[PDB]
Amino acid sequence: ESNGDVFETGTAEMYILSEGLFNQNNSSLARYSFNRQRCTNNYFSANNQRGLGDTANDIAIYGNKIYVVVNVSSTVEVIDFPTGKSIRQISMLRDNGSSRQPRAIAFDKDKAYICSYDGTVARIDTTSLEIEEIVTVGRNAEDICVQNGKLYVSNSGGLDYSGPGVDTTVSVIDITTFKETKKIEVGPNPGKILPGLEEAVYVVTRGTDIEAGDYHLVKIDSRTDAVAITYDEKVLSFAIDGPIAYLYTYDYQTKDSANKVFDLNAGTVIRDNFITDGTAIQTPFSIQLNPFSGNIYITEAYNYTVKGDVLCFNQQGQLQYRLNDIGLNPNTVVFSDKASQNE
């Protein structure tokens, strides 16, 4: 079930979200307690006697609640952090009752913001857990983050590729008014979006035909709401640590991949292979930092039909530990420096 000493500094627990497979209704949530050295592979269903659903796509801890965005079940599952017990299942539906298909969540003050493939952002109150307001953005909204009092939302248009084609913009929402103020042109099929230093926002663009590998990283200046830099590096997903990005790209035709350390100030590669100890990853499926230790966490999805792994590296590219067979297509790892009250 693991290799290496399962250890983290400054961290009580980790949560690993697994999306399962599209239309197979088999998402799952694992919890690892560093404090108790205990892994629970089915943390949501063990405590709630039902499954998370189909294509669980994002997870975050905010305040003292865990939020899981479940894309195809079209819900936001809100969970009490101390107990692991469901507080509310928030159905995300269009005015006609159809699925919005939510994707990602971000937070500011006492509000949560969920973007959805129907082209909307919903504001939820973190106390009442009611949906308060809906605003339209661009097409097939994919990811969302907060910077400088504003929301930034990638309008992928990914589901539209065969119709009008993919979309090409990041929507900007003023949080105070909750109104869309601008659509910034960034390039085709925007995806993962993250805030960085000095009011920056970084977004991946995946091209008009995602399979072809026309991938870029784009930097937006949130002071002027305009593109500052377009890099040439092929980037499919990334994580930010100050002026350094830890990133990967994947070739859906050849199945080759690369995981790299990248200098965001220079636009040049620091290390062509992030991993320095020979550890092999076949299908990198997520990348993120543990904010309490600085370690790099990458998930492994294999051929998408067998359970994947979570790998923990230091910034020097040395594997600290891995947890294997954690869930089907693990896509997000989040961390708590406070222990829950659940064994």
Binding site for ligand B12 (CB under 6 A): 19, 21-22, 55, 57, 71-72, 101, 156, 158-159, 161, 189, 206, 210-211, 252, 304-305, 329
Please say which residue, 197 or 212, places its beta carbon nearer to ligand B12.
212
Tokens coding 231: 């890099």
Quote the least distance from Cβ 155 to ligand B12, whole Å: 11
Comparing every residue's Cβ against Na ion, the nearest one is 44
One DSSP character per residue, 121-164 reads: EEEEETTT--EEEEEE-SSSEEEEEEETTEEEEEE--GGGTTTT
Total residues at the site for Na ion (CB under 5 A)?
5
Q: Is 157 marked as a binding-site residue?
A: no
29 binds, among ligand B12, Na ion, none (CB under 5 to 8 A by kind): Na ion
Quote the least distance from Cβ 174 to ligand B12, whole Å: 26
| 8 Å CB contact between 156 and 190 | yes
Q: Is the dihedral of CA 228, 234, 240, 244 positive or negative?
A: negative
- Residue with structure tokens 């026309």? 214
72 binds, among Na ion, ligand B12, none (CB under 5 to 8 A by kind): ligand B12
How far is CA 231 from each of CA 38, 181, 226, 262, 289, rounded to the nearest angstrom?
Answer: 42, 25, 15, 11, 22
Residues 6+ apart with CB under 8 A from 163: none
Q: Is 71 marked as a binding-site residue?
A: yes
Site for Na ion in 4-63 (CB under 5 A): 28-29, 42, 44-45
Interface with Na ion includes 161 (CB under 5 A)? no
Tokens coding 310: 């979570």
210 binds, among Na ion, ligand B12, none (CB under 5 to 8 A by kind): ligand B12
Rounded to whole angstroms, the Cα distance separating 144 from 291 reads 19
Quote the least distance from Cβ 310 to ligand B12, whole Å: 17
Q: Is 211 marked as a binding-site residue?
A: yes
Interface with Na ion includes 99 (CB under 5 A)? no
Q: Is 74 helix (H, G, I), strand (E, B) or coil?
A: coil
Please say which residue, 295 or 332, places its beta carbon nearer to Na ion.
332
Interface with Na ion includes 72 (CB under 5 A)? no
Q: Is 252 marked as a binding-site residue?
A: yes
228 binds, among ligand B12, Na ion, none (CB under 5 to 8 A by kind): none
Site for Na ion in 230-259 (CB under 5 A): none
135 binds, among ligand B12, Na ion, none (CB under 5 to 8 A by kind): none
Residue 146, amino acid: V
Determine the Cα angle at 29 with ends 274 and 50, to 5°.
165
Residues 6+ apart with CB under 8 A from 35: 12, 13, 339
Q: Residue 213's closest CA among 202, 222, 221, 204?
A: 204
Quote the least distance from Cβ 36 to Na ion, whole Å: 18
Rounded to whole angstroms, the Cα distance separating 220 from 199 reads 9
| 8 Å CB contact between 337 and 10 | yes
List for the chain the helix, strand, coil content (%; round to 5). Answer: 5, 50, 45
Please say which residue, 57 or 288, places its beta carbon nearer to ligand B12.
57
Please say which residue, 44 or 238, places its beta carbon nearer to Na ion.
44
Please say which residue, 137 or 200, places its beta carbon nearer to ligand B12.
137
Please say which residue, 47 or 99, places its beta carbon nearer to ligand B12.
99
* Helix H or strand E encompassing 44: helix 43-48
246 binds, among Na ion, ligand B12, none (CB under 5 to 8 A by kind): none
List binding-site positions for cob(II)alamin: 57, 71, 211, 252
What residues are designated binding site for beta-D-galactose?
63, 126
**Contact positions toward Na ion, by CB under 5 A?**
28-29, 42, 44-45
Residues belonging to the binding site are 57, 63, 71, 126, 211, 252
